[PDB]
Amino acid sequence: ACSLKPSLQDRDLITSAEAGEVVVLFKVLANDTRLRLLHALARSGGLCVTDLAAAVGMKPQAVSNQLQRLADRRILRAARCGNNIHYRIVDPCVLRMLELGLCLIEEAEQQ
Amino acid sequence: ACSLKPSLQDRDLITSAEAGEVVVLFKVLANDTRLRLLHALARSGGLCVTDLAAAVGMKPQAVSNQLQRLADRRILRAARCGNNIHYRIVDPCVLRMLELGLCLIEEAEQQAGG
Numbered sequence: 001a002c003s004l005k006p007s008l009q010d011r012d013l014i015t016s017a018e019a020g021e022v023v024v025l026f027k028v029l030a031n032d033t034r035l036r037l038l039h040a041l042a043r044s045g046g047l048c049v050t051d052l053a054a055a056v057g058m059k060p061q062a063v064s065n066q067l068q069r070l071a072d073r074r075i076l077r078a079a080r081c082g083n084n085i086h087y088r089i090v091d092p093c094v095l096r097m098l099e100l101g102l103c104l105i106e107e108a109e110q111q
Numbered sequence: 112a113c114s115l116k117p118s119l120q121d122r123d124l125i126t127s128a129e130a131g132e133v134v135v136l137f138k139v140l141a142n143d144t145r146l147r148l149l150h151a152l153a154r155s156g157g158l159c160v161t162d163l164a165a166a167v168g169m170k171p172q173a174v175s176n177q178l179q180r181l182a183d184r185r186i187l188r189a190a191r192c193g194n195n196i197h198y199r200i201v202d203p204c205v206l207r208m209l210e211l212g213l214c215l216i217e218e219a220e221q222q223a224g225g
Contacts, residue, residue: 002203004153005210014150019143022212030137032130039125042115089113093215100211101133102119104204
């Protein structure tokens with residue numbers, strides 16, 4: 001089978017409060033639309049809602065509330081000028097989780 | 112900062128097809144109790160329901176049901192001899208994602224003075 005990393009075998013059992021915080025992040029990524037939006041935001045380093053909706057092939061109204069909720073959770077920053085709202089990822093934890101997910105997909109391709 | 116790692120900036124936008132398999136990984140991990148159970152299993156390299164339920168704050172019967180479900184989803188291997196069932200994590204994707212979670216909890220603690 002597989003075995004926990006040798007240097008991580010000395011950490012005390014994660015507490016419930018510790019688990020809930022990381023679970024918030026896992027919940028955020030456990031959704032294909034959020035994953036795709038976060039991936040698009042990560043490649044570009046930030047897009048307005050019109051360009052973002054375009055990249056993931058959806059109507060802006062289909063993704064606008066989801067982005068706002070991500071900003072509510074302090075995972076994105078929403079910069080409004082006029083009616084243009086530009087989003088970018090400000091939580092590096094969410095980014096590292098996404099990167100590991102991308103690694104697993106490449107490896108699934110056997111590459 | 113928050114920039115994507117340069118080696119990963121070339122892959123095309125993840126499709127809904129590729130997103131499906133990784134989303135299932137996050138759904139399994141996106142639960143307080145399951146994550147603590149998975150860590151307790153990862154620390155020890157495998158436990159029975161009685162030791163594992165003692166390790167976390169839970170009753171053996173609830174823990175038992177949780178473990179057979181993870182086994183049903185092929186996250187664990189349930190090794191039975193007699194009436195003793197020993198559970199081990201056999202999904203390495205689950206394992207790396209748990210380990211990343213553990214590193215983030217540690218870095219967060221460090222970064223706030225302890």
